[PDB]
Symmetry: C2
Subunit: 253 residues, 2 copies
């Protein structure tokens, strides 16, 4: 029996391979998470089938507590693994079994260069510059439930204007380029664009300390096996090599 792997298209984690031949099966995909998935399959000795999740979402719960996206697939036993930049959160951990993190990140700010803005505190105290995050993502949920006075003031801004929240990273990146808009985005993706689009930069440091984990249904025996494999991959400096493999662009002066 092969494992069902649900995932999403997100640079540079999972991308479509380009080729002259028509590609079938797992051959269609490439990226950091694809290399990580082949490495886990190598260590644990299993075959898998990659399926893009249909609703194209990571996992948010509605007012009635029901989930969507990849997290729902794991809950409904419709998938064995969720290999994607799936942020480890307490609410998601109460529904699925996260492996230990394979990559660290924190929430930060994507914005233009040449601005006296030095922190998220500067965005909260002003109104001319609009800010937001990907709707129903981990970052937006952080601001929604946070009690820090600065982040409470920022969430009142995002929730009041529905256009402040973007559908995905691509729209948020586009909005920071076409309007006076700052995107609250996870640091790993910020590092990826700031090395390829020299117009954008990171503002301030990291506001929190989180990680990406491999999602499994609760009670899955593969969680602890993947955790140990991720630990072996880190100690062998291989998570370091394959991250530098996909994150290194031309750079920005």
């Amino acid at each position: 029996r092969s494992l069902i792997v649900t995932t999403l298209l997100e640079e540079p984690f999972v991308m479509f391979r380009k080729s002259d031949r028509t590609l079938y099966g797992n051959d269609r995909f490439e990226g950091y998470c694809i290399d990580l998935l082949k490495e886990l399959a190598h260590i644990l000795g299993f075959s898998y089938e990659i399926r893009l999740v249909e609703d194209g979402k990571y996992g948010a719960q509605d007012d009635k507590g029901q989930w969507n996206g990849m997290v729902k697939e794991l809950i409904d036993h419709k998938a064995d693994l969720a290999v994607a930049p799936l942020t480890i959160t307490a609410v998601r951990e109460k529904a699925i079994d996260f492996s230990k993190p394979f990559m660290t990140l924190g929430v930060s700010i994507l914005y233009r260069k040449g601005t006296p803005i030095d922190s998220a505190d500067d965005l909260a105290k002003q109104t001319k510059i609009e800010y937001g995050a990907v709707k129903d993502g981990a970052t937006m949920t952080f601001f929604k439930k946070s009690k820090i006075s600065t982040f409470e003031k920022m969430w009142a801004f995002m929730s009041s204007k529905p256009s402040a929240l973007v559908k995905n990273n691509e729209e948020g990146i586009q909005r920071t380029l076409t309007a006076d808009y700052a995107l609250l985005m996870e640091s790993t993706t910020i590092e990826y664009i700031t090395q390829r689009n020299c117009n954008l930069t990171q503002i301030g440091g990291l506001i929190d300390s989180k990680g990406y984990g491999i999602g499994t249904p609760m009670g899955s025996p593969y969680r602890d096996k993947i955790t140990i494999a991720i630990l072996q991959l880190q100690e062998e400096d291989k998570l370091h090599i394959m991250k530098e493999k996909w994150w290194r662009g031309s750079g920005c002066p």
Copy 2:
């Protein structure tokens, strides 16, 4: 009540200074003590803190038997292990780690003004000695490492028995008294380098690890503590808790 095994290690678990004799859990204070009180209240359990007898974190011997807090958890003599216990693959095969409550990496503790800039600089030369705490997580990393730089560095530490120190307190002195660089976890480096302005961190972080709460394998408290640690992080409580205990006179 749950039995919690731990170790004396600044600033995670320390003896609370007092004129009168302290008994029970009142004897201890520190970051891990504050974390345990926070976890105990969230999960609603009572506990008894017991310093592990052999005074060790957890290493394997020649016969494969564990010692320290890890063995304490395997033999079910303790329910939780609240200490700066580094999450490693070999330990994860023996106990159930919670998700990390603190991030750290291996780095270098050495004197200021010295030319050494990285661990690779230490490997290429021989006049400046280097090592780590014996049978700790750092030493075990170099012993099993296949990276060519770390394979060479482990040959150096193992060749001269004095390169391995007994604990952090002795290792800090060897950087303060000899031409010696200590391979130390970054969180402990950050703590001392703000108290002893003659020491500094050489280079960046060599790897990326974390401290986790140890439980016996199959413990129902693992996920409960994991979720509680995640809530503590999202509520900025782990940030307040670390800043409280990472004090010092400060160094320019």
